[PDB]
């Protein structure tokens, strides 16, 4: 009940990269370092496995590994959601009954991908994992190829395990969920500010807090600054160039926070791409980034690409 | 070597995306399976998608995946082309499930582009890259799914390998005639425009859904010529398979039919009661001794389908 | 540092898994079992052991069922993972799983049905000693090999090394007990006088799932051979068949636990059953775990599970 | 009524050969090594493979590299000689999944061991075998040396009701063996050094042979052509050697030294030392070369040649 208005309180949530050593097994070194980071740096929430956690990349027994880890390190100090969603209802029932187990605050839950389902069947999958904890419900048509419509997410809203909407459509659809007091956390980092300020978000789940979270805090708290908005667009431009997390992946390792390690299918951003990320850095500030080394270019051979991970 | 196994699956015009029916509590029914694949055969289908979005791979552990192929290749694959969608978003699963489906003989591989987790060109290239080379490929472009086009230059780059086949294209003709003017071999994904792919656009055939119910019909669409009559003919019955999401419809119908015992893996429920009295007109329209099955087509009661969570 | 915490343990439960009827875990009747452990004095929990039917439990509920333990309970009890396997593989990512989630340490079988050359079995403890702090168990009565004391007194020189759970006798728990190795006894019906005449620092026990408190007194108030004496009894119930038969048909008879077995174990009959109700009246069932009166059950109350 | 022709096809076997799993050097299956080992297992006389049991490392599998090894030996060589995938575990769980995807993929017949390490009742013993008996052809392994539980008669005479029950691979001795031959219960034994005396006095059906990896003709001719205390004598030394460590230690060495697998040892597994493979060279020029698998020249192999893998 409050484990639920505890998630709905939460401005600022980190979809955190999960960083791998060379042979593409994780580094939890790296990992326990960027989580302290966002903490430090006043991160609310993480979530665990997400499509900027290469999530659907990972094997079921590394995710909840994983997210059994961040509830045992530092569940005490940030809230843990973990992305136990899928196209499977068997899968998405299985990974949340697992993540609550082990004491994870809240699940992240897509509309089935892929393998796209009726209304009907939509509602469906929902009902089996809404009543077991605190649940974001994901909106994102542009990697699901399906609209979860108004009438899906009112329904859900009966249920009052369901915290609020991660909505990717747009400030419209946002505010269609906030004026009737539906919590929406925006999921476009270039839209967050405009989506906090003027259509009634509670916050971000946010990609570009992995590389300035101190700067994506301010815009979440400090009162509307389309100062800082536009000062952090270039950056935000320059993350979703390509498909995420292939930017966040490439930019973390540049300020040396992460190897330069990707499990296939994502590689890394080119030379030309690295040459403008040292040009962002140098103009925002290399202080408002994680890490303390020098933002570096990288050559091409230092990027390890694996596919048997 | 390789130049033969490939030329075999680019001979096929008739490839059946193959529905797997369940037993009451959610596991394969194996029984109900091996009748499905019986009746391909003898109406004319050359090949089979095992797993695919229609055979709800989607839903499947790797073990059953991997199971149903290599069970699909030892009772059949002497007499069906035998082709495992052991795609995946994740390089990993798509490397691993392709070597095992071909370890067990399987003839050809489904490789789509990642979804949801969607990659750069240079991403998707890097994908192929790893599964191409283990045998026969057909790259399957379905953007409406996936919500990334494989765009042509992607193609084009797989075609110098010898090991691609070819592409199962769901853009349209346009797309279809962009590859089959330069000698790439392209199946229609999309059965409402496999006539007028095939007999005008250069498609060899169709990877098809309507197949499960009307296998003859479809076998004559694609070998006989153009036939406008029994392509409009059809067009109801396509109509209504796609009105929700394949595969709820082509689900819905074989339970119908009888050949399909009325179980739902979810995320997907059958379609409601008004749809299923539409099919039973549609049977009668086209005639019962052109679909599957024996059994008097039945409408069914909402309360005759079971629906899976935990399988 | 870490390893002091799991030397200084005198009391540590080998804990059964309960099942729903369905076959998967039933984690409120475990939680329920664990709160009861940690009331009457369990230092310490074996999670996924044999007692717990580590060997039956998916990969994946094995790593959850650690991960919960610890997230649960581990501010107020060891928790020490069974992650050793017959497989080098199994054993070195079960084990960094393991840590990774907290548990406090893991415990290490050597190689069974595949069993190995001491070459061999040196190789295999090496990819796990380093993860963190490391029981070493000796059961040569199921690995059908014995870890000879050459191998013990060699890993003992690493610091990760915690000690040895050995069941082969107070012979052996004595000469590594007087040369400084810290051992539990794995036997019940032997852990008292290995505890009070053989150096041991205390027992990981089937038993204590039963009688919890009597277990923790046996170890702790001192030398006591008429409470040894009165749980003897018991403890040949327990062991007429393999543990875990013994115990499963014990906390079904108990209500703790439903009468819920995983094959290929299947309850002791119904004569055994009732032997069981006697013995509880004999010691005392307010001794006994749970509240309800203690049941007989009919051959038709257990339910067994092939498919889960 | 095909259950009987099934089963009793594999009653017929005399030479079983327990295949070993060869590896690249990072771990994963040599497919093509171990397709020119059943190859030669072929040509050589043997008329059913075990695919991963204890020689083939089945411990060490993941269930997808085992179900995808039984599924490839069936698809490869399934018309040629018999495949009876090890499908058993000491989880009845995990018994009833493997035989069933075993069976659905065309294996001839299982081979079903009692549980293990996790040892249950002679109720549970029974139970856990009713549960694959009925999915076709099954063996039933005793194996007390390695189990720590001898399937004592009563279960194996009550287990023999069921038509599935093709017969027992039997490791206590010829005594055992005769108690079972004798009430025409079928019988290999698991023992290399004893299989010719069971086979000519105590009435076993042949062997499922580690031995055969090395010499296959040898142990066909052992198998088929009548008594022969002189070959057998001859084979004594070179089954010595294959068992002063743990199998499969000395068939994964051997197989390395006669160049037919790669020096590749998944853990807990490790070679013979030196002064054994030098052993190994003198067993061979003994017996003559000819006899045994390969056309490479025997090597002794320098320890650095030898790559040890955990995390495969
Ligand atoms: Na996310
Ligand atoms: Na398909
Ligand atoms: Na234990
Ligand atoms: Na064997």
Redesign the interface.
Known sequence: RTNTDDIRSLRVITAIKTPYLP?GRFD?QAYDDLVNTQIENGAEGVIVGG?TG?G??MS??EH??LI??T???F?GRIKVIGNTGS????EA??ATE?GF???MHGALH?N???????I???N??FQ?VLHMGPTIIYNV?????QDIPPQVIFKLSQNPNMAGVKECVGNNRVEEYTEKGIVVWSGNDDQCHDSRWDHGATGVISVTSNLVPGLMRKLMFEGRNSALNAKLLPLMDWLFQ??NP?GVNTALAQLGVARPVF?????PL?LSKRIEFVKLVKEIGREHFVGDRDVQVLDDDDFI?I???
Not at 87 to 90: A, E, L
Request: glycine share 12%; proline share 9%.
């Open positions: 042979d939890l499509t290469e659907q990349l079921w027994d909840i590994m059994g880890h509830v045992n390190c569940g196209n499977s209802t068997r029932i299985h697992q187990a082990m004491g897509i089935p991908y892929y393998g796209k389902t009726s009907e069947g939509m469906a999958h089996t048509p542009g990697r699901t190829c390509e498909p292939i499990r296939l299918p994502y590689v080119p690409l596919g048997r991970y």
